[PDB]
Amino acid sequence: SVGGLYEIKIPTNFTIVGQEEFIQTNSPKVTIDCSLFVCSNYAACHDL
Amino acid sequence: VYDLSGFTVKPVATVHRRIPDLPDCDIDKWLNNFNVPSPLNWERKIFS
Ligand SMILES: *[C@@H]1O[C@H](CO)[C@@H](O)[C@H](O)[C@H]1NC(C)=O
Questions:
Q1: Where on this protein are sugars attached (chain A)?
Q2: Fewest CB within 10 angstroms: A10, A44, A45, B6, which?
Q3: Is there a contact between A43 and B15 (Cβ–Cβ < 8 Å)?
Q4: How far apart are CA A8 and CA A1, in angstroms?
């Protein structure tokens, strides 16, 4: 500070800027048929 | 809400495809040949 005054840059003109932000709040609801996944339609596999 | 066990559409017919007019292999004629080799000189025949 010179004489108790500091040098500061104060804006003389301005604009409005837009910034987008995606926030994930959901996801695909994956469902798995464990029986059909592990054994397609093979009775010998469903038995085990 | 209950997701039931997965079903598969059961077959309504059967498809069976083979090359027609092929000769008999005659495996028994070769296995029944009376000139039997020893393990030292084992004989081989290929059927196709
Ligand atoms: C502010 O900036 C805009 C874009 O450069 C200009 O059109 C406008 O005249 C400026 N205003 C001042 C007071 O400097």
A1: 13
A2: A10
A3: no
A4: 11
